[PDB]
């Protein structure tokens, strides 16, 4: 059905910087699938973040990560940028891009892009 | 873009008899109760009209079957759309349906009809990609599912919707929308009628006194065409297209004499052919 | 060879409202292809005089470039406290382009 | 200095051609204003011609086919006033003008009245 | 671009007599002033309403701002007064004012 | 906004309404000069492709702009051929073009590699070699930038204020003439047997009104003797009947 | 109207680093651009030129390590690859433009620090 591309790739930064995560899509286009994100630290669980809201048509953000994390969307080239800032110690983790159905009422993340580790 | 969904099925086109159909208003004068006679390009009476079942929902496991090959536009085409919800859309007329020959492209959206005589590049399966806009919960129609480029354009136009579906009846409806496409010496002439068709899908024995919409200067000799279908992007069904079921009728025109009985209101009620039978 | 420049003086401690004379001498005879730049340490070089004899917008007549040939002069008048910065002379005659070593007006 | 033709009296309906010669400067590089002066009333700008080209920016107040031609051989600007009528029994002036919008009517001709009656 | 400067003049001579061209809302910096005599081809006195052309005495000065201009004939005698026309500018219809006739005691 | 004059806009206008009348209703263009023949006589005359040459120049730069004349703007920016049936329409736009500090959005070609050809322009930023030694797109000696910034300030003089100039080069080509005005269309009189001239259709008779439903494609009707019976208006579309008046 | 430069840092000598200068406000296509070097306490030393109008690259023979300059004009950007580095090249780099008597476009970036040393 759908082939999801890499989100950022190999990204490594020393403390005191900021990195984007541009989730790319293929087989579909951007304004026909809602985006979502998952922190996954090595040896830890899942930590949902970002997200597009099926209700309100708004692009969600984790209540625990409001203000710190933002997102933009370029629908033509299908690039969904996820901007991090205010780097801390435990920030290093795999940042998975995922997606839900365009219409509404979906909790699952069936396609994803194998995530991206960051550096602190 | 323009998913290559032609399945595998040619769907052998069936045949129907256009009993009393394809009689448009050919003249520029309003005649009242006048038994005129016209030497124009009409659809022959009781002629083999190719019924094209366009989207063929199969009974085995659904798997609707796609259609609309490149039908010849030899002289003029009598198009009869019966579909309830407007799966049918504008058409992709043109000699090569490619560049260097401006392929006339009609496209009906709910807002307005868009007529473009440009040099389009239609891919394998020109259709309407009616996908979910997902902003304000809309139904945005990707039109690049029809062609791959739009350039070298000489005519462009926007008018009132051709395919007006006033369903509102749920039976006794699916208005027979009839359009005579007529390429008179570089002038695409379109005719029309919305008729409250009674039967399920067969052409009823009514007098389709087609009224013309527009006469657009083209200059190119259109020899082929193919209707466009509104396909909805399906979901994960426990890429995805082919919503609804589509069936229409295509007849061809011939330069044959007709008799035209106008009424006291100047409408055509009786119409008898001349090269049909001795009577 | 390359076209050499010499900025005299390379540093000059000034006071309020003097008439300082910053000469840029060239190794060759350049008609007017010399410019002047103002720069506080850490800022961008703000052009002061172009063609070595023409003022710049936003900068009043307190700056005044003159000269020709090999000898050019930034002749600054009525030195106000925000004039004390690092000034540069620039050639644009031939390639490569060489800038002055910098001259620093500072308060005493 | 500009010179015109003598005062003329003409017929209604027909046309007339007045001329204006120039001396003292380069004709072909100096516009020629044409201005009417009504009988015992104010002035009226009827137009001007470029001496080199057909720069006949014509006034719209009266469309009496008052065309403006010229000739640089004899240095004469011709105002051809057609459809002579009671509204044309005024005195016409050729005037020196600037070749730029600096248009000033400073050097004039003698002024030629074109009287219009029921007869000569 | 209408000009309605002054109907006419009736004052004792040799005074700084003013004629005020009250132009319309077309505030045009350029203007002109010409002197017309009874059955005489007029001649532009004040060019651009600020500049003086060669051969004009300084008895009649011209000034003004925006639309409203003025012409002050200072020490105008019994041998110079006549009609004084205001002349318009760039605004395409070059309509001239109704003039300023000058009669004196 | 308008364009530069080194790179002016070539607006090809076809399929146009009567607008020369509106161009007279404006009555604000400073340099409203019109060539070939006097402007009013081009009112109902229709050209095929009117080329609006859109740019902004100076009040002294329009001195050079004239059919067949030379000058920096008329030689490196926009040359006007001597044979000109068009219409030069310039108007002072100091309020619009110039802004506080200097409107440098427009540029102009002070000097060029060569001269300009009738009704053309030069957008080539390639640095011309004013002298002999080359620079090959770079700056230096014997080479200068082809583009230069205008002085377009709110304090610019009347001879320097930015004049917005559209040169409606009216072009009569062999294509069907599109851009024409009312074409001498006099007002219709009704209920008077006359010779109606309906887009060349000549015919005599009492012109009443018609209730005859002419579908939009039906302008004029016809009879059994190829004689029009019911007609319609070209300017303000309205239907009419005919009865040839008494013989 | 603005210039952004890539992130600088420390690098082991003899390596190569791509340095980007992206512009905003007006395009780099119509103009040329320069790379200049400034060490702490050093005067402004021009390094390289790029000119998109034609096609050519001019380097400084004083500092000639084949720091190759190229364009990405789709997004107003230009790349200088620093090759064959040495300890003295540790300095801040500036994306510049020269106003040579015709235009007024002398725009300079914020400037980033490149460091050529084996000690991070
Ligand atoms: C214009 O197009 C029509 C339709 O393609 C051409 O008519 C066809 O001509 C071919 C070759 O002779 C026949 O095989 C088809 O059967 C014809 N179709 C019909 C029924 O019209 C026509 O010749 C073209 N005209 C020009 C000048 O190109």
Numbering used by the authors:
A (entry chain P): 1 to 120
B (entry chain A): 14 to 251, 256 to 296
C (entry chain K): 0 to 107
D (entry chain O): 3 to 122
E (entry chain E): 2 to 106
F (entry chain C): 346 to 592
G (entry chain I): 2 to 121
Describing publication, verbatim:
Numerous human NAbs against SARS-CoV-2 target the receptor-binding domain (RBD) of the S, primarily blocking the interactions between the S and its receptor ACE2.2–6 Recent studies have also reported antibodies that potently neutralize SARS-CoV-2 by binding to the N-terminal domain (NTD) of the S,7 raising the possibility of formulation of an antibody cocktail capable of targeting both the RBD and NTD. Amongst the antibodies identified during the screening, two humanized NAbs, H014 and HB27, and one fully human NAb, P17, target the RBD and confer effective protection against SARS-CoV-2 in animal models. FC05, an NTD-directing NAb, was demonstrated to magnify the neutralizing potency by ~500-fold with an IC50 value up to pM level when used in combination with individual RBD-targeting NAbs. To precisely visualize the cooperativity of the potential three- and four-antibody cocktails, we performed cryo-EM analysis of the SARS-CoV-2 S trimer in complex with two sets of multiple-antibody cocktails (FC05–H014–P17; FC05–H014–P17–HB27) with overall resolution of 3.6 Å.
By contrast, H014 and P17 were demonstrated to simultaneously bind to the SARS-CoV-2 S trimer. As expected, the binding of the NTD-targeting FC05 does not affect the interactions between any of the three RBD-specific NAbs and the SARS-CoV-2 S trimer. Not surprisingly, competitive binding assays verified a rational three-antibody cocktail consisting of FC05, H014 and P17 that simultaneously target three distinct regions. In the cryo-EM structure of the three-antibody cocktail, there are in total nine copies of Fabs bound to one S trimer, where three FC05 Fabs bind on the side of each NTD, while three H014 and three P17 Fabs bind at the side and top of each RBD, respectively, shielding the intact S1, thereby completely blocking any possible contacts with receptors and cell surface proteases. Interestingly, nine copies of Fab molecules are closely arrayed around the triangular exterior of the S trimer, tightly bridging all three S1 subunits and restraining their conformational transition, a prerequisite for viral membrane fusion. All three RBDs stand with an open configuration upon H014 binding, leaving room for the triangular interior on the top of S2. Interestingly, binding of H014, but not P17 or HB27, prevents closure of the RBD, leading to the significantly increased transition of the RBD from the “closed” to “open”.
